[PDB]
Design a protein around this nucleic acid. Structure first.
Lengths: 60, 123, 50
RNA sequence: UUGAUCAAAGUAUCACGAGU
RNA sequence: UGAAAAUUUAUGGUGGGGACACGCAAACUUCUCAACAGGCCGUACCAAUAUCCGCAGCUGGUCUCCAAGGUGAAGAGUCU
RNA sequence: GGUAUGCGUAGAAGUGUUUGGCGUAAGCCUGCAUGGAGCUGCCAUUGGUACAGAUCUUGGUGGAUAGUAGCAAAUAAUCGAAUGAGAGCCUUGGAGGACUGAAGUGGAGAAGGGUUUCGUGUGAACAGUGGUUGAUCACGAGUUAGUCGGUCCUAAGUUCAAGGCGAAAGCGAAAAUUUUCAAGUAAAACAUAAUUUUGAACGAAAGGGAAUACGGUUCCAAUUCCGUAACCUGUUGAGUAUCCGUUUGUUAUUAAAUAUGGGCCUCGUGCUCAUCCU
RNA sequence: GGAAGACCGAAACAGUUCUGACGUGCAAAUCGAUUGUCAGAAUUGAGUAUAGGGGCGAAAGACCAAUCGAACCAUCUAGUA
RNA sequence: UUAUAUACAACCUCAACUCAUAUGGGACUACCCCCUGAAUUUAAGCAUAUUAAUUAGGGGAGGAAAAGAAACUAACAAGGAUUUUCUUAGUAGCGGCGAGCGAAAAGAAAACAGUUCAGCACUAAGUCACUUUGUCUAUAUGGCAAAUGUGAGAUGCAGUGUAUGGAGCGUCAAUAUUCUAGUAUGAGAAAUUAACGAUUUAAGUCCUUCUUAAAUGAGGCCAUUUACCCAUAGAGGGUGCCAG
RNA sequence: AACUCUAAGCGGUGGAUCACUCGGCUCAUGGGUCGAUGAAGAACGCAGCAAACUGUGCGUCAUCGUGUGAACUGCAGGACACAUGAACAUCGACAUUUUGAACGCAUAUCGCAGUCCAUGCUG
RNA sequence: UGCUUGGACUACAUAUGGUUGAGGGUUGUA
């Protein structure tokens, strides 16, 4: 679940996750918070593992 | 870490600069996550430092772009708008200082005949 | 609601973060006579209209 | 008589030939 | 005497294309099958004897949808 | 403005006061008390120059009544337990007797609200009784769409190229005139051709309109997530009326062939004829 | 057979009487019983349209944001008395 | 070349262009320019008048604007652009001749600056704008040339000249290696003058008293006709109270 | 003793007074400074801990240059790389989002495009 | 050609020029 830029596209967050983490992604579900912060649910592919990358970034 | 100065950055090339830049944004993403995660060092307070550190890379990388665009636009009429000396709008529209001083042949003939003399009408 | 603009959720975003107490530290600055937050709106007490 | 119509047929003379 | 346009579909038409039979095929094919993709913005909660308007936790007001058994003509009135 | 070689942290202004007098009075001096930094007498000249009133202005306070009017519609609660400093509440949970009574005091949406939502806490304030509770306060959270909506279409209408008008700003403009004032077409020459009068755009989360539903899941979201089974729009790819008489398979009958025939000819191998399905 | 600005009446919409409540209210027009209509000149939302010596009016000088024999706002303005 | 039978070349009038380059629409508001224009009030009523040739105005500019070089005054012994102040003057005049309004010439002063067109005659378009090629340097909506490259331009651009006028001739006088204007110019071994930041703090925290919380107060400091020191610096502010 | 009346003391309520004052009001002086190169104004975002105010535009409490020469300060951290510069001033280099002066067409639509180049997957 | 993400452009009014033009406007040579 990424807090993204407010002008992010759902076609950005596809290509701004691969470019940052070497990841293929499946389906992105983007909502704006009532703080007015855009929040994006990136569901990865099957062959990747979300917990595997979460330690790799630092979301422990 | 040792503070990156524009006095140092101006010798580096535009090839190095973005490579020097990329390791600061890639450093900055690792500190944003370090803020929300409860950065266990009291602060990795780089996000004051490494944020303005990028800002002095983008300035030098844009000055070198902007000075290099001026010499490719010398001895060309029609410089681009943003290379054309902003001063105001009011003095931009008004009669370039040569052109105010154009002199009709009556005006440059009655000038040269009678010079204004330098006298002293004194008793 | 449930059917609002983009411009109206953006303005109601902003008025949700201006609705805050004063930070506990700025009471302690030298020459900081900020007693309370003064312009704290409150959903049934003041509306917005504005 | 609760149908139908557009976009030339013919014609003449030339192009009257091209490819052959 | 009881909306318009978007959008859709059919058929009619001249001209034009497809069009060999010893086949090789084709088919914006108006058949069947397969890949790929689908952005932006809203989405919580109240909807009122306490989230709305009436200076208020004001007997007022504020558009709709669903609708049980009984007795009875009945979405009545009493009971559940 | 001059003056008093004035007064002052060894206590100025102010304020209080059964300090003591002065004045006919307006007033004034003085002691003590408090206070904690400025102030006065005289001669001039001046002023935003004296308050009891104005349903005066602005702030404060009394009686009433500091506890009186009153906190009485919507049938109603009661037990015992747990809490807790304290419980008639709502604090909760078990018994419980009742009400609404499907045209509900029920479950959801529109407009409106704007985080009230939901967890963890909690003192004051607020909740016209209380309060451990709360739509409060403090801090963390939470709204997931190709299919639900917008978005798309046009309605009444906004009328909106200046041809016009007005000193301008601007215009109770179903314009009615503004060269092509057109919306236009893989359309030939020697302004593509019969053609269109209005340009242009808005205007409906109830009208018009492509398509999705079920089982599960959260403290908070669900036709939006997970599960499983579909679909619509778009682009692209691969199979799919489609090989004839005859004779290549096959002696022919047949068989590939969605159908052949036809004269001729030595039969025809030769000739010729034909598929935009039935 | 099933017509009708026909009938009694529910929801709704209205507001007759009590000159009931209330009248420092629950309310700057409400509460209660009693009544009027109820298939239509019906009741309602949403979008529109009409703007102040103007609008709208099945007409009361009614209504046009608790404001109407002329809205509201700021100014002229410290009007004049 | 014109029965509306084709073409060519001009020109005029007029189109279109996501043509190349340019302007235009600010918004401020005190002043300024042009418009447009009430009524409160006053008249002890009121209607012209008055408010006021003004609030509201309401379009357009600048550092000022507007004005401005006589289709002016005056009647003299004559003055001489405009603007502003003083005076004329609360005057001549206007006015239900009521309430009320209301200027200018002359004089005095501030400051002073003059001028350009159109149009006979001026008798070889002598003219401009870009356009590319050099050159000149600069952020030159440039200069010098060049092709005379388009185009503008005789439906007239340039020079000369302007109401208070001229243009040429004769002509007289003076005179002509010349000066004026302008860009570079180092003027002056930086020279002056002005702006600006400056830059120096000159001179006591010297001794006692009260605060005992703090001296910035209070008393002291040889003589020099008596004053610790400086003063071209006793402006102001900061400093635990009044600080050269 | 209740209660009442009168006075001072003490305590409360209350904020006058006086004394102050980085603010105003007035007068004067030096100036001319202006947007289609996008102004004035608006919206929204931005700090390690920030609500506002101030500052500011994805480079976002800044900012190149330059001056000055050790700080900022509520805590924390860094810095102190002062000799190759803290913080402040200054500001000439860069930059300046959505708007309004959207300059494609438009609205209580974060709506819908046309042409052009480039990157990526198509292929 | 199909999609993605970036850039650049496309408002009206006007001046001069450029470019294509229009006219039983006015003539001219064929």
């Amino acid at each position: 679940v990424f807090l993204t830029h407010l002008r992010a596209n759902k076609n950005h967050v596809r290509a701004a996750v691969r470019k940052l983490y070497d990841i293929k992604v499946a389906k992105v579900n983007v909502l704006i918070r009532p703080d007015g912060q855009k929040k994006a649910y990136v569901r990865l592919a099957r062959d990747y593992d979300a917990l595997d990358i979460a330690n790799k970034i630092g979301i422990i | 870490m040792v503070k990156v100065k524009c006095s140092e950055l101006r010798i580096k090339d535009k090839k190095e600069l973005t490579k020097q830049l990329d390791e600061l944004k890639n450093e900055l993403l690792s500190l944003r996550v370090a803020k929300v995660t409860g950065g266990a060092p009291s602060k990795l307070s780089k996000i004051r430092v490494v944020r303005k550190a990028i800002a002095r890379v983008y300035i030098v990388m844009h000055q070198k772009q902007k000075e290099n665009l001026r010499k490719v636009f010398k001895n060309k009429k029609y410089k681009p708008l943003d290379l054309r000396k902003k001063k105001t709008r009011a003095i931009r529209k008004a009669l370039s200082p040569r052109d105010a001083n154009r002199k009709t042949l009556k005006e440059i003939r009655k000038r040269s005949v009678f010079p204004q003399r330098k006298f002293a009408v004194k008793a | 609601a449930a059917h609002k603009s983009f411009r109206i959720k953006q303005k109601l975003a902003k008025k949700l973060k201006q609705n805050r107490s004063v930070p506990q530290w700025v009471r302690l600055r030298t020459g900081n006579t900020i007693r309370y937050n003064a312009k704290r709106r409150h959903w049934r007490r003041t509306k917005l209209k504005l």
